[PDB]
């Protein structure tokens, strides 16, 4: 994708993440765990449902039209009826092909984006207390129990609390 | 039974924007296209591992 997260610096997806689209996996002094990220999963989901509802919105209603099958050769007028219809179908067929091509490119890039956006938010909370290991994982340079990880996941992590401990571990 | 969209082959659902059943139609109908399938992504890239 354009952002290089999904199928990029995140080396692969997690078949085991079954209650969210994006999330966290951790290891600390109390063990390891997993949690869906609620906001991003929902951010991705709403856009895809939004686009989809736009796509499946409002078919046209048509009633009396033209004949499109003919049991006799008639020439000029039939040629024209068949040409108009054939033309209409090729145009719509083109529109249909183009619409899904564009949507899918956009669906893929927006999902890559949410991953990248989630990743960036995590980095920002952590300030100087962690480093990006480059594979979508952060190394946290302080003791960080389950409540601490959860504090990161729920967006209330207070970087200042751990900064002295962390900087000491990073640089000394 | 109940259906807004009717073709000479029979009624069809009109929940999808396109159809490949028949260029002849009556009612609130998807638009006829030549393709017999068109997939709209509704998820991210799938990258399974090992």
């Amino acid at each position: 994708g354009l952002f290089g997260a999904i199928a990029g610096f995140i080396e692969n997806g997690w078949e085991g993440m079954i209650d969210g689209w994006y999330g966290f996996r951790h290891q600390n002094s109390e063990g390891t765990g997993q949690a869906a990220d609620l906001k991003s999963t929902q951010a991705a989901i709403d856009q895809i449902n939004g686009k989809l509802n736009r796509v499946i919105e409002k078919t046209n209603e048509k009633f009396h039209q033209i004949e499109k099958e003919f049991s006799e050769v008639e020439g000029r007028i039939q040629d024209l009826e068949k040409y108009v219809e054939d033309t209409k179908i090729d145009l719509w067929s083109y529109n249909a092909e183009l619409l899904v091509a564009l949507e899918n490119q956009h669906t893929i890039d927006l999902t890559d984006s949410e991953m990248n956006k989630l990743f960036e938010k995590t980095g920002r909370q952590l300030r100087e207390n962690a480093e990006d290991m480059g594979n979508g994982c952060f190394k946290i340079y302080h003791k960080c129990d389950n409540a601490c990880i959860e504090s990161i996941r729920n967006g209330t992590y207070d970087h200042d609390v751990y900064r002295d401990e962390a900087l000491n571990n990073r640089f000394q | 039974c109940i259906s807004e969209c009717i073709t000479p082959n029979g009624s069809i659902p009109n929940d999808k924007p396109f159809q490949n059943v028949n260029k002849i139609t009556y009612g609130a109908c998807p638009k006829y296209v030549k393709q017999n399938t068109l997939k709209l992504a509704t998820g991210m890239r799938n990258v399974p591992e090992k």
Partner: antibody, heavy 121, light 114 residues
């Protein structure tokens, strides 16, 4: 083709130990949790515990933390459940089952055919 | 732990008729966090291992016929077999996976009424 091949039937006497195996194939092994659930005859299903297949950490049901240990061999694609100090009340079918997700917060979509273990003197 | 308790213990229904099994969990298995119910339903025929029919309390496993459906939220759940066929005669289990330990219901044996 997801498959779970469990060890053959086992008969053991009280106070002894047993170790069952579960051999997986058809899916990436370290991406799904493994669970061990038993069933006494004519009874309900009883979860014994689970193992995180990547890391290898476990947790067991408290009625079993004393005696059950769950293991995995990542190159073997295989799980192992070992029960000690067996009693007649441990006579049951022992299923291994793949979690729908590792971390155990997920149902089971694939169960092994079961291993009967009988405990009597 | 979270106790799963099914009702009724045994249920007899006529062929083609409707079958309805109920499940209550000792604590809620809904996560406001993920907006999902962590609940599953399994079928078990004698000798055979359990088979998921339904997960997320209301999602049907693939390949499972559409006559099975489940619903409910939080602590109240309901499995339904809309039009009972002979192969549906089995034991059904509900299953919470909201938290370890996994617990299951006691099981509802379902038979053909005649």
């Amino acid at each position: 083709q997801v498959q779970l091949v469990q060890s053959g039937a086992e008969v053991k006497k009280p106070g002894a130990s047993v170790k069952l195996s579960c051999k997986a194939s058809g899916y990436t092994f370290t991406a799904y949790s493994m669970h061990w659930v038993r069933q006494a005859p004519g009874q309900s299903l009883e979860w014994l515990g689970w193992i995180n297949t990547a890391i290898g950490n476990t947790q067991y049901s408290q009625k079993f933390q004393d005696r059950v240990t769950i293991t995995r061999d990542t190159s073997a694609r295989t799980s192992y459940m070992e029960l000690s100090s067996l009693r007649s009340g441990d006579t049951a079918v022992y299923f291994c089952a793949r979690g729908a997700s590792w971390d155990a917060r997920g149902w089971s979509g694939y169960w092994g055919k079961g291993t009967l273990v009988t405990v009597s003197s | 732990d979270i106790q799963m308790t099914q009702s009724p213990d045994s249920l007899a229904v006529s062929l083609g008729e409707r079958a309805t099994i109920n499940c209550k969990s000792s604590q809620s298995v809904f996560s406001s966090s993920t907006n999902k119910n962590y609940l599953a339903w399994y079928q078990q025929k004698p000798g055979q291992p359990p088979k998921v029919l339904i997960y997320w309390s209301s999602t049907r496993e693939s390949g499972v016929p559409d006559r099975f459906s489940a619903s409910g939220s939080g602590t109240d759940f309901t499995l339904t077999i809309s039009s009972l066929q002979a192969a549906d005669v089995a034991v059904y289990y509900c299953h919470q996976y909201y938290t370890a330990p996994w617990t299951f219901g006691q099981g509802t044996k379902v038979e053909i009424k005649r």
